[PDB]
Amino acid sequence: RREIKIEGDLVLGGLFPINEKGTGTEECGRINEDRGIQRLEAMLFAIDEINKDNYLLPGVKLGVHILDTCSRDTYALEQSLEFVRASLTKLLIAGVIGGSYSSVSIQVANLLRLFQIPQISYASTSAKLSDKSRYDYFARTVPPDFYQAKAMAEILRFFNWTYVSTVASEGDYGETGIEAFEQEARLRNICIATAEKVGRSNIRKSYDSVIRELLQKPNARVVVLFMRSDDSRELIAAANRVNASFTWVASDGWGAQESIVKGSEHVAYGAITLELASHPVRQFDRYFQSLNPYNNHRNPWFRDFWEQKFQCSLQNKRNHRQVCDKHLAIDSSNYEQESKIMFVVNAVYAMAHALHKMQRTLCPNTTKLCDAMKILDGKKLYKEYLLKINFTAPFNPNKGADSIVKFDTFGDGMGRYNVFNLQQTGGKYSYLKVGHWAETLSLDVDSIHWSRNSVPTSQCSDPCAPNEMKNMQPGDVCCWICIPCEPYEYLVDEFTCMDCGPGQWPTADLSGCYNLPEDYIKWEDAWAIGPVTIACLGFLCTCIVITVFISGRELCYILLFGVSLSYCMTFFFIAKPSPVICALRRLGLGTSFAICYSALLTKTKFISPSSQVFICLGLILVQIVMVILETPGTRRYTLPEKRETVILKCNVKDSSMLISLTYDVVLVILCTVYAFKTEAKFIGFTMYTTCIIWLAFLPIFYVTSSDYRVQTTTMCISVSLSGFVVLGCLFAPKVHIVLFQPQK
Amino acid sequence: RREIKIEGDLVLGGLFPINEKGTGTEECGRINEDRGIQRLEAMLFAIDEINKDNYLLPGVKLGVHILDTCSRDTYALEQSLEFVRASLTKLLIAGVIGGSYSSVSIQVANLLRLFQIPQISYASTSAKLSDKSRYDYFARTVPPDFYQAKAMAEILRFFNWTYVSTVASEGDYGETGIEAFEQEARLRNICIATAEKVGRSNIRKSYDSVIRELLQKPNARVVVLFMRSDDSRELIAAANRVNASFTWVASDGWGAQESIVKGSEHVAYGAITLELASHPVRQFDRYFQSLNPYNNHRNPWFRDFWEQKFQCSLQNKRNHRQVCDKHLAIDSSNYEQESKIMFVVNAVYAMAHALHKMQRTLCPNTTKLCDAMKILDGKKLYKEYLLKINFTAPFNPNKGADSIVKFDTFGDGMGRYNVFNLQQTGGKYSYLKVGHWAETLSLDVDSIHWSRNSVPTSQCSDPCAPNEMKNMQPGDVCCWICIPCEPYEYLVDEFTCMDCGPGQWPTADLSGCYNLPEDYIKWEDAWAIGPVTIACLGFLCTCIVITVFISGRELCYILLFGVSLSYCMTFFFIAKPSPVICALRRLGLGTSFAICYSALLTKTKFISPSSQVFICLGLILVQIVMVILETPGTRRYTLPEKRETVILKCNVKDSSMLISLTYDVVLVILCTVYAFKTEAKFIGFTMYTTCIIWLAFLPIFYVTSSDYRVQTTTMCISVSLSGFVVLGCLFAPKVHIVLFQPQK
Ligand SMILES: N[C@@]1(C(=O)O)CO[C@H]2[C@H](C(=O)O)[C@H]21
Numbered sequence A, B: 001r002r003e004i005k006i007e008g009d010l011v012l013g014g015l016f017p018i019n020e021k022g023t024g025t026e027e028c029g030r031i032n033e034d035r036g037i038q039r040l041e042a043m044l045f046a047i048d049e050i051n052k053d054n055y056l057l058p059g060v061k062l063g064v065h066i067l068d069t070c071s072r073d074t075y076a077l078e079q080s081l082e083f084v085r086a087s088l089t090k091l092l093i094a095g096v097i098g099g100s101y102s103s104v105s106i107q108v109a110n111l112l113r114l115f116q117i118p119q120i121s122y123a124s125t126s127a128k129l130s131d132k133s134r135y136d137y138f139a140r141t142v143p144p145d146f147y148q149a150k151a152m153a154e155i156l157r158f159f160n161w162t163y164v165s166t167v168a169s170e171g172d173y174g175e176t177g178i179e180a181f182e183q184e185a186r187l188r189n190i191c192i193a194t195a196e197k198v199g200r201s202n203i204r205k206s207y208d209s210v211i212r213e214l215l216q217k218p219n220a221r222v223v224v225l226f227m228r229s230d231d232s233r234e235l236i237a238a239a240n241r242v243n244a245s246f247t248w249v250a251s252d253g254w255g256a257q258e259s260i261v262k263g264s265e266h267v268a269y270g271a272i273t274l275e276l277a278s279h280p281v282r283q284f285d286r287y288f289q290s291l292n293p294y295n296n297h298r299n300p301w302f303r304d305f306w307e308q309k310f311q312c313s314l315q316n317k318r319n320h321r322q323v324c325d326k327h328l329a330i331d332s333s334n335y336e337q338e339s340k341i342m343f344v345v346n347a348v349y350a351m352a353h354a355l356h357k358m359q360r361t362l363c364p365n366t367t368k369l370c371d372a373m374k375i376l377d378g379k380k381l382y383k384e385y386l387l388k389i390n391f392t393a394p395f396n397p398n399k400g401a402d403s404i405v406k407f408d409t410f411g412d413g414m415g416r417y418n419v420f421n422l423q424q425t426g427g428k429y430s431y432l433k434v435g436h437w438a439e440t441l442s443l444d445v446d447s448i449h450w451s452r453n454s455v456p457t458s459q460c461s462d463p464c465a466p467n468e469m470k471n472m473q474p475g476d477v478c479c480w481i482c483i484p485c486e487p488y489e490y491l492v493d494e495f496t497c498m499d500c501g502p503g504q505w506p507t508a509d510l511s512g513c514y515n516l517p518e519d520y521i522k523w524e525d526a527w528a529i530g531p532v533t534i535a536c537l538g539f540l541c542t543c544i545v546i547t548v549f550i551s552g553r554e555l556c557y558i559l560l561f562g563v564s565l566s567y568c569m570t571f572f573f574i575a576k577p578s579p580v581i582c583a584l585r586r587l588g589l590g591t592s593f594a595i596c597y598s599a600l601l602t603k604t605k606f607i608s609p610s611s612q613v614f615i616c617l618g619l620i621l622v623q624i625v626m627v628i629l630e631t632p633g634t635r636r637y638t639l640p641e642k643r644e645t646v647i648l649k650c651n652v653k654d655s656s657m658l659i660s661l662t663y664d665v666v667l668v669i670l671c672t673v674y675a676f677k678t679e680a681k682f683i684g685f686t687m688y689t690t691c692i693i694w695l696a697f698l699p700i701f702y703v704t705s706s707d708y709r710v711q712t713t714t715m716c717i718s719v720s721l722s723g724f725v726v727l728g729c730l731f732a733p734k735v736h737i738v739l740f741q742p743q744k
């Protein structure tokens, strides 16, 4: 019963969410101050200007039949029948400036298409409405949501927010808007933590309940809101009750409205919102601010709008009529243009230009309506003129940013968006443009005020440490686990790690492998150094015995050579092992063995036996023909358990050394039964005892087969022990005779 | 232009998908033989019977205004205006038997609610239509999809199909139907592998493309189809081109139709479909089979239906008029009732009963229409009579299975479903009822024919081995990993495993821990057994020395006791270690030490020194006062690397044993300078040599600190060596005198 009707040659219908959707009991609730009245006056402002100028339908006066949708599709369909009552076969509306809600526009488009009434819809961004095979009389001055979904996944990719949660309003704007976003999120490798839907249906969860589900997954600290204006207002309220806090990535449903966050700015602080690219209509705000509840009689809802805006009473709102000041008026202090005001004016002018071009075609003789337009053809108006319209946007400077009002082949606008940030200015909140999106996002990250004073991170799992690997479970991208690889495996990639080569450390960066260092007994071996001094001390004792003198002299020379060789071999064996000098250590054992053979040969005329005694020993075969070992190469000793432990192992296993030296160890048995021959009796007893000590030492080294570093000292101990026996026993008769008896 | 109109006092509207949806060019395609014509004739059959009998509106003749929806909401809205043309303020349809598609029913309900025309809709199962605040003049003889979603998650829970993929038609039946299923899947811990949508919109992927996405995740071998009849027909076709194969869990959209799988039965074999609980109307098939294209003149689509059903030409379909046999007719050979035929008859009768009760109220005097029904009140008809209707279902035996046609408070039916299985009968495919769902599913699993001849498994990850653990990543239930726990940790639960106690094996089931067995040298030690025989052999030699005889006799007794004790201690030490007998091993070392002290005391009048010699040694303090060890308890030797290796370690560390026995080892040094005293000279030399051998043996045991099993044999070797020295040296003079000289 409440409507706007203005007489005119051609009448344009208009659907505006003038009053916000009511509760369950009341179909129509409070008034929509920004998105229901400013837009309504924008249509009225455009129609006044269209009739004012003489270049757009000068001979035709444009009338209006504007209704209210109450933000409900069912209510919108109820009112929309007035546009079609006179159109039955039996005001003859030429066109309809479509609804401001995707559900409302879709509902009314399904009806108007039957009667061939073209519909231009500002602010309706559902991607379903671009299906021209179903809505064949529908065009919009705003882009679809197929582009807004791109502008979100790009923002969620610029900041590596790969683990996000989605909340979407029920209907067509939210269901299809979030359906395209999850498609654009999959391409950019973004994982949806959880997807929820809110609305007034019984299936939908409560706003507190959906808030809990967002909090259940604390890793995803950003949520994307493809929600309507009322749901966005209420969801932020539900986050105030729980006192939660997220980073809000919002759509044009939220947009750049201060009223959504009114009172709950604490949780909505640092929000990222995607408003369509638009500019204020400067001529419009002059028209709007001049309005008063006394002259705007043509607008029925304006009287109620005046009361609600200023919280005063015109006649009986506060049981009286004195609260509303007579001098009070709309000004820049309390008024800010709705973002989609240009898209309403362009929508109205698109209809006028379509008729104006058609009028110049069907009625060229007269500027007024001719007989061809007594009955109007909707299909001709839409397909030929409206769908191919092209003009400079009125009331906008021709700076190129205003661009054109052209529709594309789908009857849609250009996909350009702005990015806003909710910031606090000394206790006052506002939206600041922090980027845009024409085809690639360009964000001014330095000016963004974040919710927690730092760039939010929304990742399913934390990055893995350099010592840690990760793997992809089937169907997941953003979620992994951090398994630390064992200190011997190495990382070819973060996806898999496996062992290096034997005796090969996996470097420090762990992405490569390098051979483990070889270990050998250095000069730090005090015990080995101490035996070396003892071996040198034994040589000094032999030299003292030699210095004392000056039977046969062959025994003295042979005994001296063996003892010195045994002492010298200990120092040589304690040196740094090498593959070239591997045979020297093997030869070192033979040098002591040759000395032992000489003692047996000497103990067993006299001048002749000396030549056959040393020669009989073999002389170690001239050191195996001047000698590099029995095994041509020296092996790096590596255990199955690496543990950063590698030993230098010569080719010889230290097993055949008991054969070459064992030749001189068998003559002691023949001297075991030897007796008398005095004073040669004492010499034989010492030699037998000396051979006994050598046998015990050999089993000790054989027992210590493992622990080469420890077993290495066994050879030094055996070498020192052998020298003591040879020097103590063989040199003992000389010490007790030459030194013991001063006669010599 | 094609419609059915029958004159009557009250006219009922009817929307049926008589012709299947056409391609892009053609709005209306082929005829819907089962779900568009059988239902249409079912409504006509009911109206004939309602006017036939005299107990349901006897004084009122029921007319019909039946239209075709072409299976499109936009086309359905176009036709539905004929029900409302006469209802403007300026046939006066009393009620509408609603559409067969949720999108169609929702679209037409939004229009009829404005003019207060009650709508009864068979076959429309969208859960959105139960929102009586939005569709306040809508009732259905079929349950909502809120119950069908339960019947799926229950089936997907009966068989542990926790990893499933969902395909849903675009619109209201599929979008809301799968929205409720995923809610019922979350409660029953079911993970959705992937959710995909199909349709004729441009956003939707192709049927081949969505088939590929199903194949991308081969773990989920079962998919749930909340899809319409045409999409289910086409999706199965797309699986034939790829020659894929899944297990199909389907909704009433698929239902029990043979036509969906016509030609692609190979991939659709072993399907699980959820058809609403229904019974054939026996009186109806009699009416249907009697129809011929010559008498059913009231049905315009019937002539086209006759041609398409039998692939013949009536007038010019095949460019001639001879293919259609005159004698050909519908019979049981080629005809099977549509499942939702009773729900159509009940829908028609629900309208008749609502008017009949209203007629008995407003016009009780006459059976005909009175002045109160010249203008009909829709709200009174719906709220008071229709919404509270209750009657026995006509043409159905009163067996209780027919039940009542009552609507609940939401204007819906009872949520009872049947479960069908697609099976092959000798090369012929058919659906077999393999269960039902009233409130709990009752499936006959033995009769189910599965797709791959075995029960399908749809799990995200395979079950973990008993040696393997698993963990839950955030937000996942059905997906895990199988990490094999190391052989020393144990499973408190499958979620976490950690180490057992030191020296405690984690049992065999791995869910517990038991102490590792203790290891000790058993009788298998041949070397230890061999030294025992040698030790016994040494005792025999001493006994032979004693038997030879029969200065002073104290030395012979003291020497014999020490040698026998040394040999005996080796056998005692080689026994099984115990904590009670720990001191015996410590005492065993002292027994040899006491013997060594006796030799020093004897070697160092004669009768008097014997008492002070053995007493001077201390006698091991009477075995430490009859002795169970220095450490009160015996420790189980455990090394940080368990490796199923535990050793029995006595409290004594084998370090103080060199002190008690060392008392008898110091007297040898005093005898080192001893000489002469002949024949006591030989005894002293042997004792000094014997002490020397003991010193070398002690370092060998000290070196072998580790390897207790190996180091254990060191004590046996040392014990045997000590006995040889004592017997060889101390007993040597007696052997060479008593045995060597036959005079004694
Ligand atoms: N994006 C909306 C749409 O339906 O297209 C939903 O929220 C409302 C905004 C507006 O009214 O300007 C639209």
Ligand SMILES: N[C@@]1(C(=O)O)CO[C@H]2[C@H](C(=O)O)[C@H]21
Residues within 6 Å of the ligand: B035, B100, B101, B102, B103, B123, B124, B125, B126, B173, B227, B228, B229, B252, B253, B254, B340
């Ligand atoms: N479940 C359906 C619905 O829209 O409610 C969708 O597929 C069609 C079945 C029918 O026509 O009997 C319905």
Ligand SMILES: [Ca+2]
Residues within 6 Å of the ligand: A015, A016, A017, A069, A070, A071, A072, A076, A099, A100, A101, A104
């Ligand atoms: Ca609206």
Ligand SMILES: [Ca+2]
Residues within 6 Å of the ligand: A101, A102, A103, A104, A170, A171, A172, A173, A174, A228
């Ligand atoms: Ca909407």
Ligand SMILES: [Ca+2]
Residues within 6 Å of the ligand: B015, B016, B017, B069, B070, B071, B072, B076, B099, B100, B101, B104
């Ligand atoms: Ca239909």
Ligand SMILES: [Ca+2]
Residues within 6 Å of the ligand: B101, B102, B103, B104, B170, B171, B172, B173, B174, B228
């Ligand atoms: Ca549907």
